Each structure stands twice: as structure tokens, then as C-alpha cells.
Design a protein around this ligand. Sequence first.
Ligand SMILES: CC(=O)N[C@@H]1[C@@H](O[C@@H]2O[C@H](CO)[C@H](O)[C@H](O[C@]3(C(=O)O)C[C@H](O)[C@@H](NC(C)=O)[C@H]([C@H](O)[C@H](O)CO)O3)[C@H]2O)[C@@H](O)[C@@H](CO)O[C@H]1O
Length: 406
Amino acid sequence: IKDNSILDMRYENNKFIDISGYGSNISINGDVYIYSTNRNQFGIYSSKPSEVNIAQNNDIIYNGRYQNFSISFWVRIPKYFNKVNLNNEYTIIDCIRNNNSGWKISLNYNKIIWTLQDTAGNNQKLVFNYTQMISISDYINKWIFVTITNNRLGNSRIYINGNLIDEKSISNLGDIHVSDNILFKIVGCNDTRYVGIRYFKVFDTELGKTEIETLYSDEPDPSILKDFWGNYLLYNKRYYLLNLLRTDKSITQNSNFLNINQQRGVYQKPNIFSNTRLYTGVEVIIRKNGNTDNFVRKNDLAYINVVDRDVEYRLYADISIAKPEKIIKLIRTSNNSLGQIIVMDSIGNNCTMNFQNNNGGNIGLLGFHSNNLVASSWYYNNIRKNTSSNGCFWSFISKEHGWQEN
Ligand SMILES: CC(=O)N[C@@H]1[C@@H](O[C@@H]2O[C@H](CO)[C@H](O)[C@H](O[C@]3(C(=O)O)C[C@H](O)[C@@H](NC(C)=O)[C@H]([C@H](O)[C@H](O)CO)O3)[C@H]2O)[C@@H](O)[C@@H](CO)O[C@H]1O
């Protein structure tokens, strides 16, 4: 609960502010990127002046040895692509006093690291391990929710996306005097890099499982759908399509049809990364039908078109087919609904698209049947419960700096 928060970083009126009430002063030095669609998201750089500093309220600088506390925030880490990234630990969030007591969040190739140390020098480390040798990653260049909880007379725990990952006793810990400041700055990184950070908070209690799941599900506006990277999905923006069941397949334009039988392919660099190609297949765009923003929200009505060199083709469910699988056809488009619309929605972070006629009657969920995309009513009564592996689940991939390919 917000009642136990002693530091709440938000962006407002072109600067960061602490809305917890303790009033810590937050200053931005150098070049700090602020995301346009969600100002609470910022990026810091490793090779040039760039940092966000929080001069903690004196009454918050924990010098105790019994005080319980927790921290949470989301971090966005670009794909590592150089050998210099392999064994190069660097801190991104620092609250260490005179190179000794305190806590800090650092990173390294395939790692997110938490360190907690006392005045004597004793410390404890928690680490989340992930990989770059994987077809599709839930971590690389995507917002990752991190949560550290500490019970002085118990354990220190690190959570990732709401789940418990590592846990160790901090009983060997005595007096812990944190730094007066909480510095967001990439320090010790031997490469030219940056990291994204959002919704950083500190609590004076040991957050429980249920309070962590709440922070995970609420912080970012839950009514707005998300793209592949975890950012807000937008109208009038090009995206590549990824089917969550057949993640190895590319969605291609055949004639006036859409195939999903071709391989996306693999992009790799020996001993650094190996992943299926994301930027392949047709580029689509989401268009509004007949407000103050371009955010695609749950239940919104919209049109989906393939963007082919300045020509847009509306995705049309061929309702002239009696079978439940109505192949998707491409029809050159501007306001003609063609007798149908698409209901945008999602189960978790999994996007769904439901083709319906004008009277609100269901035609079918976008999916595939043989080797083609189709709108099928079969999905309504055939969705696997807790798994993204459903032919009617999709992700929209925007080509961005944090993930480069051929
Ligand atoms: C083929 C068959 O006899 N089944 C008919 C149904 O076919 C399914 O139709 C839906 C769309 O309406 C999908 O195209 C489905 O494809 C998958 C799927 O579940 O998405 C592709 C999966 O990759 C595949 N999994 C594996 C491991 O191979 C599954 C799987 O074969 C089935 O779930 C097992 O039954 O299928 C099509 O299989 C559909 O046409 C209905 C209604 O007309 O009639 C069935 O007879």
C-alpha cells in the first residue's frame, strides 16, 4: 500500500518529483531521455553526462539495523552485442555510502544484481539470471519489473515480474547506513550503453507477495494495451506481427492472402546472442474508426491494415466462407468499414483481435488455420488458460534502437 511508501518518483511539469510526502529533492543532470508516451520512463547513458539524483530527506536516510524496507521499479536493458559486455558489471542505481555501507542495483551480461552491505563490510548478493541464447525473450530490451524486499530479522528477496527469484538471509548484517542520495547513473560500464527506468519507489516495510503483484499489475495504465517491448500500443504506428503460438513463423503477403508458414529466421553472434528474427514479414498499422491521444485501449474498435510502400490494405475476414475459419483477405483502402470492425483487447500482455460485423455480431478471432491467417470463432471456446501459446494471441513489434538485426 502507498501508505508504506517513503519515496515515490513521478514526472510532472518537466521534472521529477517525490510524491510520498517526505519531499526528497530529485534533480536531473546531463542528458536524460524522457519517453514521450509515458513520462515516468527515462533513460540514462553510460558514456556521457547523464544522471537522475535523489537527495533523500534526512528523515529517510536509514542508518538503522532493524528497519525493514523494500524497493521496486522497472528496468529496460538493451540486447548486449559486444564482447566487452560479457564480464562488465556496472551499477545503475546507487545508494552506497563512501564505497562501503548501503545498497545498489547493478547489471552485467545476463544479470540483474542487488547488493546490500553493512558498515563492517559484510554484504549479501541476490541475482536474477536470464539469457541471450533464446528464440523469444521476455527480458531483453523489455520492461522488467524488479522488487527487492528486506526483513532485517529475516531474508532479502528479489522478485522479477511479481515472482520470487532468489532469497538469502541478511542475518550476518549489522549496521547499514545508506547514502544520502539515490543516484541513477550508469557507472563502470566499459561500453556505450543506456538503460531505461520507470516507477522507482521505496517502502519502509517488507512488501508482501500480494502487494507486489498489485504494483506489477497497476503502475502502468492497465487499460492501455502494450506492444512487444512493454510500451503503450499506439494507433498510426508501424509494427511487425508476431504470433505467440507459432513464434518461429513470419507473416507474409502472398497474393491477397496472409501466410504464416515462412520461417522468421535466426539472427546470431557467436557466444553473445542467438534469437529468432523479429523484424520480418509484413508491417501493419492500427487505425481508429469513426480522441486526445493515440493509445490503443482494451475494447477499442479499430481497423488493421498492411502497409505496403505507401499503400494500405485493410485486413478483411472473408465471410463468404461458411467454414468457421474465414481466411483473411487484403483489400486496398478510407472510412469504409467494409461491414466489419476489429475489437482490440488482451489476456495478460497477449493482444487479441476480434473481427465483428456492424451489429456487434462476432465473426472470429484473428488467428491461423492451415498456413494462412484467419478469423475463427473456434477460439472463443478453445483458449488455453494460463499460457501465451494460443494461435489467437499476437504481439506488435516496433523496430527500435535497443534491438538491432540484419
Ligand atoms: C484439424 C482438425 O481436425 N481440427 C479442426 C479445427 O482446426 C483448428 O482450427 C483452429 C482455428 O479455427 C486452429 O487453426 C487450429 O490450429 C492449431 C491451434 O490450436 O492453433 C495449431 C496448433 O499448432 C496445433 N498444435 C499442435 C501441437 O500441433 C493445434 C492442434 O492440432 C489442435 O488443437 C488439436 O485438436 O491446432 C486447428 O487445429 C477446427 O477447424 C474445428 C472447427 O472447424 O474443427 C476441427 O475438426
